[PDB]
Design a binder for this molecule. Structure first.
Ligand SMILES: [Ca+2]
Length: 876
C-alpha cells in the first residue's frame, strides 16, 4: 500500500466539531453489504475531527486502504483531521487488547511498556498516516482478563498512557499528532486523568441523553448528581476549558433499550425532514452550552455521525422500521450545529471595542483568552505590569476575576468603578444555562454569588485619585501605598475596612494620608474613609486555657468563663457592648470610621449552637455548661462549633482543689479473646463510641467477653453504658468484671486456654438499673479481662452493650510491678525473717511505692524508680 505523506493544514481553532464514524457503515468495508451506503470521505469541512470507530472483530481491509489513500487526503485537504479511536483495553493487555495481546513481545515491564506505547502509535496512528489517537475510557472498554475487570490492567494502562504521551500530543516527540481522551467518567472516577491530563490535547465527555445533560438523579435527596457543570468542574482541575468537548449521539439503527438517548428530534410523519432540524434538540443545547466559570469550551461531538439526519423513534409509540433503514446522510445536523457554535456570542473575538488601549487588549487576550465569552467567565489572575498601558477602559467587562494586579502603570491617573472589574463589589452570576433541569427538584436554581476580585496595586506612580467607595471591600491588602507618590484624592468609605489602630489596613491608609496632606488641601472631600462595617468573625484562639480554683459550693458557668468574643479580619478583639462602643468612636485625623448604624448585635458573633464536652480525670463525660466546684476533681473542657463537632474550637483544663492526672481508657481497641458474645459486636464494645449507631447486641440475654488490653497499664476505675433510646426494662441489670491473675493456666502461650478454665479474680460485681455505671478499682495490672452481663429477661433477652471502659494510667508491664509489691509483703509474709534492725528500710518503701501509686498525680518516673528499688532484694 502507498500511504501519501501528510499535507499541510492550519492549526485547529475553536469552536470545534467532532464526529465518530462507524467503520461498518463505510461503503468499502464489506462490498457484500450493499446496504452500507455512506463513506467516511464524504464528511463536510464543518467536521474538524473525524474519529474512526471500528468493530475490532472485522478486517475491512479494503476500508483501511480507502482510508489511507483517498479519505485522509480528501479530509485533510478540507482541514478535517482523522483520529483513530481505540478502547482503553489496548493500553492494558488482557482480553481483546489489540496489539497488547502479544504479552510475550510487550511484557508488562518498564522496557516492555515503552515498547508497547511505540507499537501502539506505529500501528494505530502512523500506519495510515492519521492525525492522532483517541483513547476511549468507559465501562465497555475497561481492561479485562477472562471477562473480569482487571485492576492490574488499569494500573498498567496508566503507565502506557504516559509513555504514549511522550510520543504524541502536546508533550510528545511528535507534536503534529493529537492525543485525545474520551470518557464517560466523572474526573474523580477516571483512573487515567490525573496522570494523563498533561499529555492530551483534548478531553471528550460522552454525555448522551437526559442523564448526561441534567445529571443523574439521587432519589434519596431528590437532587441531581453529576450535572454537566459538576462534570466540567471535576475536570477543570486537570485541563483548560478550551480543551473540553461534550458529546451527544445520533440514533443507531435497531438500538436496544439503554441505547436510546433522544439527542436529536423524534420522528413526525407530518414533517419527514425533522430529523435534520436542530432547533431545541439536546445536541443544539450542547452546541450552546458553556461552563459558568473558567472559559468557553472547545466544542462538541456526535457519536454515529453516519446516521446524521435520521429521526429518532418515538419513546412509547409503535414500531417505526423506516428509521432503522440505512441511508446516505447529508450531514445536515453536523453542518448546522457547527454554524450554531461559530455564530455564538461567546466565540466573538476580543477586539478594540472591548479594550481600546492596544497594550491592555494584548495582555487580556494573552491571559484571559481571545474570546469574549472568557471575559464573562475567567476566574484566575490578571496581571497588568506593562507600563505602556494608558487606559484601563474595558476592565469592567471582566466579570469573575479572582485577582487583578496593577503593577507599575506609571500613566494611570484614576482608579474607580468605571475601570475596575464588575466584581470589585459583591455581585451574582448573570449567565443563564441552556440545559434542561429536573423539575423533580423544585428547590434552588439560584444565582450564585461571585467572589470579589482581589486588588493589588503597586508602582502606579502617577495615580492621583483612588475611589473604591461603596464596594464592600473586606481589606486594603495588596495596596502598596508607598509607591503611590502622586495621590491627591482617596475615597474608601462604605466598605468593610477595619481601620482600628495597629492593623495593616491602618498602615496602608496612613501612608496614603501622608502622601495627600504633603500635597494640597485635605478637605472634607479629599480623603474619606468612614462608614466601614467590617465583618465580625470568630476568634481563632481564645484567652483562658487553664484555671485553678478552690473547692467551694459554687456553680460556675464554664462558657461565660472560657468562650466569648468577636474578631475583625484584622484581629480586633471585641468581647462586649462596652468594648464595641469604644471601637465605634475610634478616630483618624479627627474623624471616626466605624459606621454609626453598625450595631454590636449587628457586628457580633454568637455562640448559640455551640457545644461543650467536659471530661473529668476518671473519663466521665458531661455536656453540662454550669459546672459545680463542690467536688475535688480535675476536668478537661472542650467547646465545639455547630459546623463541626469532631474538632473543638477551644479547650482548657479546669483544676478544682489539687490536680489529679487525667486517666485514659486502656480498654480502647482491646482485642476480643473469647466468651460467648457475638465477635462482631464484641469488638464494637471497645472501639470507642458511647451510642454506636450500629447494633450493640451481644447474644440473646446473657453474655460474656474475654478480652485483652492493647497496652497494659495500672487500672484505677471502670465504666460501662447502656444505650439510651432503650427502656430501663432492657438495661443490663447485673454485671461482673473479673481480672485474670496468676498468669496463664496450663500456659501453652500460642496454644491458648482461651482462659476459659482458671481461677480469675472478681474485681467488681454490679447490681443495679442505671444507664451508665462507673466505679473505682484497686490498682490492677492485668492484661486479660472478662466481663459478664445479664439484663434479667427471658432466654430471648438480646442483651446489649454499647461500650465498656477500663480506666487508669499507662504503665508498661505494671503486672510485674504488682507481682512484686504483692510478693514484697508476702516475703514479709514468709515473716520467718529477722531483719528488724535491717528493715526500717524494707518498710519505708512498700509504704512509699504504695503511697506514690495511690497519689492523684501519676508520676511514671517515681514508681518505676521505687519498684526497681525493691527488687534489689531478689538478691535477698
Ligand atoms: Ca462502642
Amino acid at each position: 500500500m502507498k500511504v501519501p505523506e501528510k499535507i499541510p493544514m492550519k492549526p485547529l481553532k475553536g469552536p470545534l466539531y467532532g464526529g465518530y464514524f462507524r467503520t461498518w457503515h463505510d461503503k468499502t468495508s464489506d462490498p457484500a453489504e450493499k446496504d452500507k451506503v455512506n463513506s467516511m470521505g464524504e464528511l463536510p469541512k464543518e467536521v474538524d475531527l473525524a474519529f474512526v470507530f471500528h468493530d475490532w472483530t472485522k478486517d475491512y481491509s479494503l476500508f483501511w486502504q480507502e482510508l489511507a489513500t483517498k479519505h485522509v487526503p480528501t479530509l485533510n485537504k478540507q482541514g478535517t483531521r482523522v483520529i483513530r479511536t481505540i478502547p482503553w483495553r489496548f493500553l492494558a493487555g488482557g482480553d481483546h487488547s489489540g496489539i497488547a495481546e502479544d504479552a510475550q513481545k510487550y511484557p508488562n515491564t518498564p522496557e516492555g511498556n515503552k515498547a508497547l506505547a511505540k507499537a501502539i502509535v506505529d500501528e494505530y496512528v502512523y500506519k495510515y498516516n492519521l492525525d492522532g489517537l483517541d483513547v476511549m475510557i468507559e465501562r465497555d472498554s475497561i481492561p479485562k482478563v477472562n471477562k473480569e475487570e482487571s485492576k492490574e490492567g488499569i494500573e498498567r494502562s496508566i503507565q502506557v498512557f504516559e509513555e504514549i504521551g511522550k510520543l504524541i500530543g502536546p508533550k510528545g516527540a511528535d507534536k503534529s499528532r493529537l492525543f485525545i481522551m474520551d470518557s464517560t467518567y466523572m474526573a474523580d472516577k477516571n483512573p487515567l486523568i490525573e496522570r494523563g491530563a498533561p499529555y492530551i490535547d483534548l478531553l471528550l465527555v460522552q454525555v448522551y441523553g437526559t442523564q448526561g445533560e441534567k445529571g443523574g438523579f439521587d432519589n434519596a435527596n431528590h437532587k441531581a448528581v453529576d450535572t454537566m457543570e459538576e462534570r466540567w468542574e471535576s475536570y477543570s482541575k486537570y485541563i483548560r476549558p478550551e480543551q473540553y468537548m461534550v458529546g451527544f449521539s445520533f440514533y443507531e439503527e435497531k438500538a436496544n433499550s439503554g441505547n436510546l438517548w433522544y439527542d436529536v428530534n423524534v420522528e413526525d410523519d407530518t414533517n419527514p425532514n425533522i430529523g435534520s432540524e436542530i432547533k431545541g434538540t439536546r445536541a443544539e443545547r450542547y452546541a450552546k452550552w458553556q461552563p459558568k466559570t473558567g472559559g468557553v469550551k472547545g466544542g462538541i461531538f456526535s457519536y454515529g455521525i453516519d446516521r446524521d439526519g435520521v429521526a429518532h423513534p418515538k419513546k412509547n409509540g409503535p414500531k417505526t422500521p423506516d428509521l432503522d433503514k440505512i441511508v446516505k446522510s447529508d450531514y445536515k445536523v453536523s453542518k448546522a450545529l457547527k454554524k450554531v457554535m461559530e455564530n455564538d456570542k461567546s466565540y466573538e473575538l476580543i477586539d478594540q471595542k472591548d479594550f481600546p488601549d492596544k497594550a491592555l487588549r494584548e495582555a487580556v487576550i494573552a491571559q484571559v483568552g481571545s474570546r469574549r465569552g472568557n471575559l464573562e467567565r475567567f476566574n484566575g489572575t490578571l496581571r497588568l505590569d506593562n507600563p505602556d498601558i494608558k487606559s484601563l477602559e474595558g476592565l469592567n467587562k471582566l466579570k469573575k476575576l479572582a485577582k487583578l494586579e496593577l503593577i507599575g502603570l506609571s500613566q494611570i491617573t484614576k482608579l474607580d468603578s468605571s475601570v475596575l472589574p464588575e466584581n470589585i463589589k459583591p455581585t451574582k452570576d448573570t449567565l443563564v444555562s441552556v440545559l434542561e433541569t429536573y423539575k423533580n427538584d423544585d428547590r434552588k436554581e439560584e444565582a450564585k454569588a461571585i467572589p470579589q476580585v482581589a486588588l493589588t496595586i503597586s508602582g502606579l506612580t502617577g495615580l492621583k485619585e483612588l475611589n473604591l467607595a461603596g464596594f464592600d471591600r473586606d481589606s486594603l491588602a495588596g495596596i502598596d501605598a508607598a509607591s503611590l507618590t502622586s495621590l491627591e484624592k482617596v475615597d474608601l468609605s462604605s466598605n468593610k475596612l477595619d481601620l482600628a489602630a495597629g492593623t495593616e489596613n491602618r498602615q496602608i491608609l496612613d501612608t496614603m494620608l501622608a502622601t495627600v496632606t504633603k500635597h494640597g488641601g485635605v478637605s472634607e472631600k479629599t480623603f474619606v474613609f468612614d462608614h466601614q462595617k467590617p465583618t465580625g468573625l470568630y476568634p481563632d484562639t481564645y484567652g483562658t486555657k487553664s484555671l485553678q480554683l478552690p473547692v467551694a459550693n459554687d456553680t460556675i458557668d464554664l462558657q461565660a468563663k472560657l468562650l466569648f468574643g468577636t474578631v475583625t479580619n484584622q484581629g480586633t478583639l471585641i468581647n462586649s457592648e462596652a468594648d464595641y462602643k469604644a471601637y465605634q468612636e475610634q478616630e483618624i485625623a479627627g474623624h471616626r470610621f466605624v459606621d454609626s448604624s453598625y450595631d454590636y448585635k449587628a457586628f457580633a458573633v454568637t455562640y448559640k449552637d455551640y457545644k461543650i464536652k467536659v471530661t473529668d480525670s476518671t473519663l466521665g463525660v458531661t455536656d453540662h455548661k454550669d459546672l459545680s466546684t463542690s467536688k475535688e476533681e480535675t476536668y478537661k473542657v472542650e467547646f465545639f462549633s455547630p459546623i463541626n463537632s469532631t474538632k473543638p474550637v477551644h479547650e482548657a483544663k479546669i483544676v478544682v482543689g489539687e490536680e489529679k492526672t487525667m486517666m485514659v481508657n486502656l480498654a480502647e481497641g482491646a482485642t476480643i479473646i473469647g466468651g460467648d458474645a457475638d465477635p462482631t459486636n464484641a469488638k464494637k464494645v471497645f472501639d470507642g463510641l458511647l451510642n454506636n449507631d450500629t447494633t450493640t447486641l451481644s447474644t440473646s440475654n446473657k453474655a460474656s467477653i474475654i478480652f485483652e488490653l492493647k497496652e497494659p497499664g495500672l487500672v484505677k476505675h471502670w465504666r460501662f453504658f447502656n444505650d439510651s433510646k432503650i427502656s430501663k426494662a432492657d438495661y443490663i441489670k447485673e454485671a461482673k468484671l473479673e481480672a485474670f491473675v496468676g498468669h496463664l493456666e496450663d500456659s501453652s502461650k500460642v496454644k491458648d486456654s482461651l482462659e476459659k478454665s482458671t481461677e480469675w479474680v472478681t474485681v467488681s460485681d454490679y447490681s443495679g438499673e442505671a444507664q451508665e455505671f462507673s466505679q473505682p478499682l484497686n490498682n490492677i495490672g492485668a492484661k486479660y479481662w472478662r466481663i459478664t452481663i445479664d439484663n434479667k429477661k427471658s432466654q430471648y433477652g438480646y442483651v446489649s452493650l454499647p461500650e465498656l471502659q477500663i480506666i487508669g494510667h499507662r504503665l508498661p508491664e505494671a503486672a510485674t510491678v504488682m507481682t512484686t509489691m504483692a510478693a514484697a509483703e508476702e516475703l514479709s509474709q514468709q515473716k520467718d525473717k529477722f531483719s528488724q534492725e535491717q528493715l526500717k528500710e524494707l518498710e519505708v518503701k512498700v509504704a512509699a511505692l504504695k503511697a506514690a501509686l495511690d497519689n492523684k498525680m501519676f508520676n511514671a518516673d517515681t514508681i518505676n524508680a521505687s519498684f526497681a528499688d525493691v527488687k534489689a532484694y531478689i538478691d535477698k
